[PDB]
Symmetry: C4
Subunit: 248 residues, 4 copies
Amino acid sequence: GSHMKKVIIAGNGPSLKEIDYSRLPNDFDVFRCNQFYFEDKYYLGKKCKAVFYNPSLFFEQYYTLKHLIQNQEYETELIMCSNYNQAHLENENFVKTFYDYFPDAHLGYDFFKQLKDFNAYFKFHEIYFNQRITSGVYMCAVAIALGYKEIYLSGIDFYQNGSSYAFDTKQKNLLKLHSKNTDIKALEFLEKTYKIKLYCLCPNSLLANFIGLAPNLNSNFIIQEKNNYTKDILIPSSEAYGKFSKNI
Amino acid sequence: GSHMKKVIIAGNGPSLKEIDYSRLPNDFDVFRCNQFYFEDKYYLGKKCKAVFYNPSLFFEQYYTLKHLIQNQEYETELIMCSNYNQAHLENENFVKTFYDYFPDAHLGYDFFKQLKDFNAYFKFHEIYFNQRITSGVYMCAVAIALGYKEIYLSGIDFYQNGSSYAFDTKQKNLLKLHSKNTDIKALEFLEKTYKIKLYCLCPNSLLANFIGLAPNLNSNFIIQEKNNYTKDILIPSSEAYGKFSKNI
Amino acid sequence: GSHMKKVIIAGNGPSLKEIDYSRLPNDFDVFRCNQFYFEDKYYLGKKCKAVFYNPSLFFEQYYTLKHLIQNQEYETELIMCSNYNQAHLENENFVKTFYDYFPDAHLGYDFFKQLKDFNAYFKFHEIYFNQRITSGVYMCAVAIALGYKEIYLSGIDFYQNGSSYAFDTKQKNLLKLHSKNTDIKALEFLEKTYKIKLYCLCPNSLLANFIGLAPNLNSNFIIQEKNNYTKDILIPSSEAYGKFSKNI
Amino acid sequence: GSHMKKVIIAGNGPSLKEIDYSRLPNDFDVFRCNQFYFEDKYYLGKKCKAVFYNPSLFFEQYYTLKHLIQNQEYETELIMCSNYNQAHLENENFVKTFYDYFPDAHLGYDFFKQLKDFNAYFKFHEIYFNQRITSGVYMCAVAIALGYKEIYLSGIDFYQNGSSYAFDTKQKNLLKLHSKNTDIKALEFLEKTYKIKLYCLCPNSLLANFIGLAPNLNSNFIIQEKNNYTKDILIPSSEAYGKFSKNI
Ligand SMILES: Nc1ccn([C@@H]2O[C@H](COP(=O)(O)O)[C@@H](O)[C@H]2O)c(=O)n1
Ligand SMILES: Nc1ccn([C@@H]2O[C@H](COP(=O)(O)O)[C@@H](O)[C@H]2O)c(=O)n1
Ligand SMILES: Nc1ccn([C@@H]2O[C@H](COP(=O)(O)O)[C@@H](O)[C@H]2O)c(=O)n1
Ligand SMILES: Nc1ccn([C@@H]2O[C@H](COP(=O)(O)O)[C@@H](O)[C@H]2O)c(=O)n1
């Protein structure tokens, strides 16, 4: 973790490409999720403090991350599975044996559950109203559970249709295998309940209509272009799948 | 919890409406259970320290409590499920995943089990003689496990038939989905075993024939009337039920 | 428990009636097992520090003990189930939910397992050679795990046939529902491994041929006769059995 | 364990018979595995700090070890099962009840899992690439988890075919019931990650081409010949198997 430190939570919405870099803090940790590596440029750098993946694609994402790391495209300290310990959302065996199949990773819920009131908030809305927070918000909850007090948001656009993501997701392998109000109310609850501060790094995003923009500390960050980079998720061998079958 | 503090345990018997308010302590926490919100007046106020619900109706009660809270009809700090960890009394999956479905609530048994001798007392009578204590007594056991030493009882009438409850329970949704000696001996065991004091707030009740009445400290409590209040339990969506199905 | 204190472990062999009372320590705790209450006299008094029962009859024994206690025939501080956590010896569900059905009792194995080497000794002989220690020895292992250093043995005769027990076991309800060397080697292992001392209180028993007799401290113990005492195990209601069915 | 102390990890490759005894440290603990007792001479002495056995043959190996100990052929302090907590590699029931069937033994994984990064390294290669480390490397990981900092390797030849083992394995009972690069990279990872030192005791082995030879401290070790020794694994009774059946 990194209590006291600043963290940038990045969703993969089109606003990820519209970061106002003059509002970027001088120092920060970076939380990325799902298909972040699909980005055509290092919008937030090669170093991540943590990467999050849904349980449904964790097996393949973990495999892909190791390739990303080995190829020196990205680095990360923590690897998180964004689970909730809910029968209708995750394979039960997957969760129970998680640390034995992915020893250097964590069950996101182990941190998420430390925020008892938000866990209740999420569970009540998901279970009774079919209202679920997105990965962007999940990461904010984990960031808070880890000790962060200043969270800078980017790439959270609430699926505006105009543009689905900050990159082309029409990838062969990936293809083979929520609302604005739900997320906003959740972030509000998080800010007011645990007394942390949320900042927005993208002035053109819808998020900017609800949370204040980060100050203009102005940093000299450099955005590096990517070349011959990995832009599709990798598929493990049939043998591998056979070994992980029990965890579906 | 609230060790040292005073607590009023309220059953929903007809004596709930016959509280001798001059015997009400100047300060206290309030424990309510099941259909308490059906009351036509705030006999013990809007603020509860804890509310208890049987496992069989917890799914719907939790849903209803959130509505009660959102509508500002009641407030509570703790939400308790009055379970016993008994196969013939509760769905096993319900208990095992309880904290993951209701994060801000507690399994009453986690406190009840701290009183090893009373747990034994209850288990022996329930299992071998089919003699079960009511919710009123269960709450007394939890109150003691939480540190309370002075317990004031109300709404405990041992089902006198003359009047079943302190309100009309002939509610549409509710309809859709023990003995005097058993409770009295249990309360006696509780008082003599953990050295706490039990007081009765209703002089016209049968309970008053067994436990002493609370002193006449005389307080200036105000009983507020209710209007357009929630007086029936709410039923969650079929979608919600589908998600909670495994916990029956 | 009672570390430093002296304990008398009583099997139910015929030597229970041939205790040399002049060798009885001035002060002691008493461990009894199974059908001890069948005795026609209080050979070791009415007060027991602990009573042990096999898992196969625990449901009925617990029921019977409560009757013995209520009727003031015996008193006990601890109630132990002599289990081993072995699939072929005990119902698995029985062990897993034990503390929820019998809150004031203990799983003997929770103490037995603290003696890692003896647990290994027992397991190896039971599993691979079908050589099992009797309840008398099991109790010695639990006594040691509890802190006792001086153990006095009685009623351990290794089933000499001449007389099976110190009382008539031809009881209606009971009827309805190992070797010398195995026990002796186990006691030797216990004495030499945990550095405790074993004494024999019955000079006419076979046990006296292997372990030294307790010194003649000479006490003024009084053996009280029993009258209209409980001399058969009690059978719980069909309703009770229905509730405990899952634990067979 | 034995932090600070030196340990000799012995595989059973043909190099076990080609130890350069002048490079043997003056004092050390010894880790042996599987069919080590098949050796025709005490190449590393009769005293072992620990012996390791795969879960598939643990039932029979444990039985055999007890015979080896009883017959005074070997002595050991620890008995380890080299497991990984992987469904496709071990019987799940075997692992869950392990400490109840073999109280004086340990699940190797309980120590192996303390090295989170190596556990991840092993799991990733095994699961996704079908690349598994041998027992020799597993023991190195356990040695490190136990506090050892200087590890001397012997009997690790990476199955050169020329000679499969340092002894004849064509044994009746045994018969009835990986790569160089995988092991070497794993040992490298271990050395560089936990900052320990690896030494090779066999100059003629392939291992000597990758890790440095131990210094010539020169000791006066004596290699004792064996006579009428146990050279085949023992088979437990059908009764025993019947009791351990659930753990396959
Ligand atoms: N148009 C978009 C697309 C992504 N996002 C967010 O970015 C995350 C993107 O990854 P996913 O769409 O794979 O979940 C979402 O969890 C959410 O927080 C957004 O807010 N608006
Ligand atoms: N007539 C009545 C009705 C309720 N009660 C008590 O009030 C509680 C009421 O809720 P229930 O009847 O829903 O359990 C009981 O658990 C018991 O303690 C009573 O003692 N006499
Ligand atoms: N003849 C007898 C009978 C009982 N005993 C012992 O007394 C205990 C008696 O209870 P059970 O026969 O019910 O097990 C045995 O576990 C054993 O220690 C004995 O050693 N010789
Ligand atoms: N030829 C051989 C044979 C054994 N070995 C090693 O010795 C161990 C031997 O026991 P197993 O072949 O039974 O596993 C292997 O786990 C491995 O570390 C080796 O490296 N080369």
